[PDB]
Amino acid sequence: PTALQIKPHFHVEIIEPKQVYLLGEQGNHALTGQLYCQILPFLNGEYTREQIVEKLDGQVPEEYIDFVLSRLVEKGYLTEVAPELSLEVAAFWSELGIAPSVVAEGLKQPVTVTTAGKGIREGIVANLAAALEEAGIQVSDPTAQLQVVLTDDYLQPELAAINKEALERQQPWLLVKPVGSILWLGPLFVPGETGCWHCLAQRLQGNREVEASVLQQKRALQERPTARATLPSTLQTGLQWAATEIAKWMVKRHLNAIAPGTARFPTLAGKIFTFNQTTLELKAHPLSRRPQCPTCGDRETLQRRGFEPLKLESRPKHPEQTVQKYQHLIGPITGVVTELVRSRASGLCEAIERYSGIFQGDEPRKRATLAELGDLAIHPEQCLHFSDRQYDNRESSNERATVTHDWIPQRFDASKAHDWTPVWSLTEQTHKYLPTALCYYRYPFPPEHRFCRSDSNGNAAGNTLEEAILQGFMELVERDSVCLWWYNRVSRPAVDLSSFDEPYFLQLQQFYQTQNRDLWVLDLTADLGIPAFVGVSNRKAGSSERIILGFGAHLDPTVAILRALTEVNQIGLELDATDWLVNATLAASPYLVADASQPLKTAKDYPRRWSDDIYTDVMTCVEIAKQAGLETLVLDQTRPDIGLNVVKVIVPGMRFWSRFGSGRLYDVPVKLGWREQPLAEAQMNPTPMPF
Amino acid sequence: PTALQIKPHFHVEIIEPKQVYLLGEQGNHALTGQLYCQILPFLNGEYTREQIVEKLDGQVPEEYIDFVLSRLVEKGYLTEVAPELSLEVAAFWSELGIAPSVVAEGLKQPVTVTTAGKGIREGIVANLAAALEEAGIQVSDPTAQLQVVLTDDYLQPELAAINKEALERQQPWLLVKPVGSILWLGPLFVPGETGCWHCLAQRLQGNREVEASVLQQKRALQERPTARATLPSTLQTGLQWAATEIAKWMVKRHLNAIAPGTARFPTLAGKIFTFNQTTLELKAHPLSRRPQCPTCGDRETLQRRGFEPLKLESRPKHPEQTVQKYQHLIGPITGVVTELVRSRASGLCEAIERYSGIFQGDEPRKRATLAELGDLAIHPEQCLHFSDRQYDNRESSNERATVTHDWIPQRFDASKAHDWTPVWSLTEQTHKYLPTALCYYRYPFPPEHRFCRSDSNGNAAGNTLEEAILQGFMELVERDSVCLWWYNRVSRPAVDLSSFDEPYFLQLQQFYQTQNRDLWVLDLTADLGIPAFVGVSNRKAGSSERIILGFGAHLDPTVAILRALTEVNQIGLELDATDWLVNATLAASPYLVADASQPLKTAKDYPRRWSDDIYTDVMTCVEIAKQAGLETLVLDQTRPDIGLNVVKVIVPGMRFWSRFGSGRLYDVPVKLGWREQPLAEAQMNPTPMPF
Ligand SMILES: [Zn+2]
Ligand SMILES: [Zn+2]
């Protein structure tokens, strides 16, 4: 004995001869047939199927009633009555696509309600307790299958203990912030399946840079934490919304116990919702479960990988689609990167890239002295190249530091022990060791002994390790080439653009003439032979030449040039710190002038060395550097939670802005016959730049 | 005597020597100065300014305290205490950017609560009544300055009376639907300022095409309406959310009474919010106040304009930005057009265009007989051109109607009177009269006497009337030209594309060869001399030629051709009803084959007649038609609420698909020497098409 009805969220309207309409606030349906008009009056829940046959005795034979009833179940218009529920309520659950008969049993299980901070008044729990009772849910004192945790802040310290309890009890729990101008629901944490609270917290702490900083400064000071807007109406909204959601999750829980994957409607599982009361904005923030989560995952993950050998494969060459792939990382709570991003998928990769570099604590390392590590170790000076002068004058020079670059660090104390991170030598196929402080952003030093500032030179991302490695390697040769030129102020040959098989170069050049601008490309290729170029554009008239520079390096010189022009273009577009743009002149800047005593570079002056494989090109690159007497090192910074590959390529010896130690910077010009004698440190280009 | 405090939504953290941080959940701020650290301990609301001077007597001179206090007011960090409020509550209002001291006075005014339908249980009012009391608001039996109206449907008939009451009482009222799976707040209607409920309703009825239709069918049947999902938790959410919002509006109301435009935070005024409980989606829907609203506006607006003469100006020639301009029209409730739209700003204009055509009831017209109107009237047959055969066989032909086109209407009964709409004759500068049924979509006929079906031929939109008029005129000549060709199956000369000064034509042509396709353009120009073309692409190999056709007409033949190729391209892209694509062949379709007995059309065969002015071009067009013996009529369908110009250009005599009455269709071929004798009706191209 079990009555049947057209789902209670439909208003049935029968238009006699042959029409029936099912009207619902989130969807309508029509049925066509004289049979439907004759049966549906009895599908109001007041009749069991045995009993519908009685009423249509002379009208419709049983067998056709059965068939029509089966049609309606298959079409999802028919459900078993739920006597123990309002139609109002039954309708809600049926509007969700669920047998309301099932619901009473799903909700009869108990739920417990608790607080995390000290910032939740006693009555607020009682309030929620009431709403849940009114929704048909058992509540008890902390057996329970859901623990609801009311807090005023998701970084409340107490949650760490609570998270552990729930992990070791395998017990779902739900966070709710009902106080404040923005209401937060979830995540509903489910120990086998979702992230833990610590998955959330290492991300959220990353989006409270300030609040962390104040706390630190407050603790330093010590012995020698928040406020909250709340109308009763907003409080009550949040609690009531939560009750709705808890209900939904318990019904889902139930259906799925019975039939795994049967219930598809959305719940708070692994999700946060924020409802802003001042700006009426609703937003979803998805919690990712972090594979390397120290609490609920494998902390040693990166430690392990760092000491395993690097594994590179073939990568033949067979968008804004990227932004979808890494969408779940864009956000103020749940995300690692914020805003819209920073086409823009370029600034997204770079933001994600920079984040990956930030030292979390799990990174591979060994505490040892330089001596202990022996030849596998690399002295940081082999990568920084600050002159002895720079260091000794570091104090006076540092006070005035024009730029973030011109911070001279402190000298490395080799005699002391340090964290050393393993990095893969492609050139020698072994690990070597670089100090961890050079390898990751924000490595925590002892205060005084800051021996470096991490820098992003050689850092790079890609959808594969090999794409990233070539990116980072070319970023390196671009800056080593620009440094050799800029600082030695070297007169360089220009490039016949027509000779290249790219109609765009000459076209863009010409276009600049209509916009009151000249444009040459100088050749910055140095002893690696890898094509490197500057684009020099100056204004034609006006009282300031406004010289804009743009760089590029690639195996294919055409690619390299295109990048240089693109950079000039992006800068040029922005314009309309320093005073280069006001003061610099070709007339007073010989190194910006093409060497007339040397012929123009054509397409034919660049021996081709790039191939269909990116692996091949990496290894081409490595060999080239070995030819120069340089070891190509790589460090994978990729994070399992993020997915996008991030590397730091390191080629010790290769030169970066603002560092004047002995090395290539002086020797290469001479070795290449740009000079009889090396230049002196005091004669290095004192103009600050480029860009 | 009136105490001062740092706004209660900030958590003040003083870091002794020189730092102070104001921490708030929607924004942080830092202050720098030893003075701030010394004064801010006393800006906790416990001290009047007279009293802060006492405490810092020996420390800080009065004058500097005053200055610092003035700084903090100017910077918006300081507010007068509100004794009669929680800090919790004060904080909410300060997080909104408002003196909490002001708030108590704003809320002390009374508000009344009521129902619209029969579908709001008694306790629901009491529920909301309670929430408002708890929020500090007076509630009374229906003096009041806000009437809150709980309903289960926004098209509830009772609202019309309520809307009138409020209009004649100049009394704000707020609609709320707290029942159902989706909660609706607002609009808050404000009689001088917002739309009325009828502004909302003519739009909303437009988005319930079905629900209207069921109601109609139900009433026809008569004497010979909805359901609603509701958990207590969802009900309570909506009521509580509303209380929040009502509060906000009353405080805004208050501040602005005192200082017009002082309060800038958002309220429900002229807005609907929907909060979906099943999919957790929050959406805003803005109510537009309709200038021609019969209830709160000027009904006679269009009536008036229709009989005033058309006013066209100069329009010299000096994007997806359009989609922003008409964004407020895209939506299921408030909007006229739905979905995303239908680049896409093309399908938006067309959707808005079609909507404007729909007969509302306000359109200009005169009830008269053909005879009464005399020569100013135009017989619909002069615009439809159905053959006598078509009409007499209308019954047999109609049963099987292949297409929406092949509905043969009924003959016009001239002897009877009809609604006649005035239309502007550009050619004669007077109004003429066309039956209203031809002029607007969905004109309500008496059932039997349906003498036409409205059609969109000559309909067109633009950001100015003149752009729309040229669009609609060219759409007309495109279809008159294609009809003459198609139906008479006329062999036509091809077009030398190289001869045109457009490198793209030859390039696209070539591209089609790589995609297994040929492509010619035939010249469809007829006796108007206005350039009109078909693009004919056929597959090269495969067992079905899959011939795709694309049309174009413009004064500039290059523009016209470009349109033809673009159309071919859009169709071609879609492919990968009828069986043309399977069965049609060049071999069996002479009219698709270029006439070899006639030379190829070059750029030089098209006398240039377009100019810098669009007005000039309209009038060029009109003159050309007058030369052909044709009156150019225009009817502005633009709606004041929508803004985008929409016209219908009518040129009686010019031919449309599927209509075989005596006229141009037979006479033009002969007049142009394409035939010695006119073709017979039975010999008209019987293949159905084109597209
Ligand atoms: Zn975890
Ligand atoms: Zn109105």
Query: Is residue A126 left, alpha or beta, with left meaning phi > 0 and alpha meaning psi from -120 to 50?
Result: alpha
Breaks in chain A listed by the residue before each, with C–N > 2.5 Å: 142, 224, 318, 342, 576
Residue type, A158: E
Within a domain: B520: yes
Out of B71, B95, B119, a domain closes at B95
Q: What is the resolution of this structure in A?
A: 2.9
Q: Omega into A187 within 30° of 0, i.e. cis?
A: yes
DSSP secondary structure, A169-199, as one string? HT--EEEEE-SSSEEEEEEEE-TTTS--HHH
| Closest residue in A to B132 (Cα–Cα) | A233
Contact status of A266 with chain B (Cβ, < 8 Å):
yes
* Coil, strand or helix at B19: strand
* Alpha-carbon separation of residue B420 from A212, B368, B471, B632, B682 (angstroms): 75, 7, 25, 18, 34
Q: Are residues B148 and B258 in the same domain?
A: yes
| Residue B92 to residue A231, Cβ atoms within 8 A | yes
* Alpha-carbon separation of residue B389 from B385, B394, B496 (angstroms): 11, 8, 41
In chain B, what residues touch A230 (CB-CB under 8 Å)? 86, 88-89, 91-92
- Nearest CA distance, B235 vs chain A (angstrom): 9
Contact status of A16 with chain B (Cβ, < 8 Å):
yes
Beta strands A44-47 and A78-80: pairing type?
unpaired
Half-sphere exposure of B666 (CA within 13 A, CB side): 15
Residues 6+ apart with CB under 8 A from A370: A377, A379, A414, A415, A418
The Å distance, Cα A88 to ligand 1 centre, comes to: 40
Taking every pair of Cα atoms in chain A, the longest distance, rounded to a whole number of angstroms, is 116
Where is B111: in which H helix or E strand? strand B110-115
Nearest to residue A269, comparing CAs of A169, A156, A175?
A175
Contact status of A10 with chain B (Cβ, < 8 Å):
yes
Token match 């370029």: residue?
A: A346
Residue type, A87: L
Tell me the H-state helices in A584-642.
614-628
Burial of A389-413, coded b for 16+ CB within 10 Å and e otherwise, reads ebbeebeebeeeeeeeeeebbeebe
Nearest to residue A459, comparing CAs of A647, A250, A204?
A647
Half-sphere exposure of B490 (CA within 13 A, CB side): 30
Q: Are residues A469 and A510 in the same domain?
A: no
Q: Are residues B218 and B249 in the same domain?
A: yes
* Alpha-carbon separation of residue B452 from A211, B85, B360 (angstroms): 72, 69, 18
The residues placing their C-beta within 5 Å of ligand 1, an ion, are A 196, 198-199, 293, 295-296
| Residue A280 to residue B273, Cβ atoms within 8 A | yes
Contact status of B221 with chain A (Cβ, < 8 Å):
yes
Mutate which: B278, B281, B285, vs A, most A CBs within 10 A: B278
| Ligand nearest to C-alpha B200 | 2
Question: Contact B89/A231 with Cβ under 8 angstroms?
Answer: yes
| H and E: helices and strands count for chain B | 24, 22
Query: CB-CB: which of A25, A233, A276 is closest to B181?
Result: A25
| Residue A228 to residue B94, Cβ atoms within 8 A | no
Way it was determined: X-ray
| Closest residue in A to B153 (Cα–Cα) | A25
- Based on its alpha-carbon atoms, the radius of gyration of chain A, rounded to whole angstroms, reads 34
Q: Are residues B542 and B421 in the same domain?
A: no
Token match 């049924």: residue?
A: B437
Within a domain: A23: yes
Q: Are residues A269 and A326 in the same domain?
A: no
Within a domain: A584: yes
Token code pair at residue B164: 């009138």
Within a domain: B68: yes
Q: Find how far residue A192's CA is from the centre of its chain.
A: 25
Token code pair at residue B414: 């001239």
| Residue B91 to residue A230, Cβ atoms within 8 A | yes
In chain B, what residues touch A273 (CB-CB under 8 Å)? 280
Residues 6+ apart with CB under 8 A from B403: B658, B688
Token code pair at residue B1: 């005597």
Query: CB-CB: which of A26, A277, A282 is closest to B278?
Result: A26
Nearest to residue B673, comparing CAs of B521, B491, B542, B508?
B491
Q: Which residues are bridge partners to A366 per DSSP?
A: A420
Q: In degrees to the nearest 10, what's the CA dihedral of A144, A148, A151, A154?
A: 100
Q: Are residues A72 and A39 in the same domain?
A: yes
What are the DSSP E strand ranges found in A205-324?
Answer: 271-276, 281-286
Break chain B down into helix, strand, coil percent, rounded to 5: 40, 20, 45
Contact status of B373 with chain A (Cβ, < 8 Å):
no
Question: Contact B23/A211 with Cβ under 8 angstroms?
Answer: yes
Within a domain: B52: yes
Question: Contact B552/B562 with Cβ under 8 angstroms?
Answer: yes
| H and E: helices and strands count for chain A | 24, 22
Where is B630: in which H helix or E strand? none
Within a domain: A670: no
Q: Are residues B341 and B317 in the same domain?
A: yes
Q: Which 18-37 residues of chain B touch chain A by CB within 8 A? A: 19, 21, 23-26, 28
- The full 3-state SS of B42-75, as one line of letters, equals HCEEEECHHHHHHHCCCCCCHHHHHHHHHHHHHC
In chain B, what residues touch A225 (CB-CB under 8 Å)? 11, 13
| Residue B234 to residue A244, Cβ atoms within 8 A | yes
Distance CA A68, CA A62 (A): 10
| Residue A11 to residue B135, Cβ atoms within 8 A | no
Distance CA A278, CA A275 (A): 9
Q: Are residues B67 and B160 in the same domain?
A: no
Distance CA B572, CA A690 (A): 51
Residue type, A482: V
Q: Omega into B187 within 30° of 0, i.e. cis?
A: yes
Count of C-beta atoms within a 10 Å radius of residue A299: 13
The Å distance, Cα B245 to ligand 2 centre, comes to: 23
Burial of B512-544, coded b for 16+ CB within 10 Å and e otherwise, reads beeeebebbbbbbbbbbebbbbbbbbbbeeeee
Beta strands A548-553 and A633-636: pairing type?
unpaired
Taking every pair of Cα atoms in chain B, the longest distance, rounded to a whole number of angstroms, is 116
Question: Contact A230/B91 with Cβ under 8 angstroms?
Answer: yes
* Alpha-carbon separation of residue A405 from A549, A656, A662 (angstroms): 19, 10, 18
Q: What is the CATH number of the domain that holds B656?
A: 3.30.1330.230
- The full 3-state SS of B602-614, as one line of letters, equals CHHHCCCCCCCCH
The Å distance, Cα B202 to ligand 2 centre, comes to: 9
| Closest residue in B to A213 (Cα–Cα) | B21
Q: Are residues B153 and B260 in the same domain?
A: yes
Out of B562, B591, B606, a domain closes at B606
In chain B, what residues touch A232 (CB-CB under 8 Å)? 131, 134-135
- Nearest CA distance, B60 vs chain A (angstrom): 24
Distance CA B634, CA B652 (A): 11
What is the domain range of residue A461?
308-363+457-490+609-663
Residues 6+ apart with CB under 8 A from B580: B547, B687, B689
Q: In degrees to the nearest 10, what's the CA dihedral of A134, A140, A145, A151?
A: 80
Token match 């220009």: residue?
A: A494
| Residue B234 to residue A226, Cβ atoms within 8 A | no
In chain A, what residues touch B232 (CB-CB under 8 Å)? 131, 134-135
Within a domain: A591: yes
> How many domains in chain A?
5
Nearest to residue A299, comparing CAs of A640, A645, A647?
A640
| Residue A228 to residue B284, Cβ atoms within 8 A | no
Q: Which 75-114 residues of chain B touch chain A by CB within 8 A? A: 86-89, 91-92, 94-96
Contact status of A244 with chain B (Cβ, < 8 Å):
yes
Within a domain: A668: no
Contact status of B207 with chain A (Cβ, < 8 Å):
no
Distance CA B260, CA B409 (A): 59
Q: Are residues A146 and A270 in the same domain?
A: yes
Question: Contact A296/A196 with Cβ under 8 angstroms?
Answer: yes
- Nearest CA distance, A115 vs chain B (angstrom): 18
Burial of A606-633, coded b for 16+ CB within 10 Å and e otherwise, reads beebbeebbbbbbbbbbebbeebebbbb
Q: Are residues B518 and B581 in the same domain?
A: yes
What are the DSSP E strand ranges found in B395-526?
Answer: 417-425, 430-435, 459-462, 517-523
Question: Contact A248/B276 with Cβ under 8 angstroms?
Answer: no
What is the rounded end-to-end Cα distance, in angstroms, of chain A?
A: 82
Q: Are residues A178 and A324 in the same domain?
A: no
Q: Which 454-483 residues of chain A touch chain B by CB within 8 A? A: none
Q: Which 384-443 residues of chain B touch chain A by CB within 8 A? A: none
The Å distance, Cα A177 to ligand 1 centre, comes to: 20
Count of C-beta atoms within a 10 Å radius of residue A350: 17
Q: Which residues are bridge partners to A358 per DSSP?
A: A441
Q: What is the CATH number of the domain that holds B396?
A: 3.30.40.250
- Nearest CA distance, A315 vs chain B (angstrom): 29
- Nearest CA distance, B228 vs chain A (angstrom): 6
Angle at A135 between CA A131 and CA A136, to 5 degrees: 125
Q: What is the CATH number of the domain that holds A62?
A: 3.90.930.60
| Ligand nearest to C-alpha A292 | 1
Distance CA A222, CA A211 (A): 17
Question: Contact A387/A661 with Cβ under 8 angstroms?
Answer: yes
Burial of A8-17, coded b for 16+ CB within 10 Å and e otherwise, reads bbbbbbbeee
Query: CB-CB: which of A91, A227, A281 is closest to B11?
Result: A227
Residues 6+ apart with CB under 8 A from B230: A86, A88, A89, A91, A92, B179, B180
Out of A425, A453, A481, a domain closes at A453
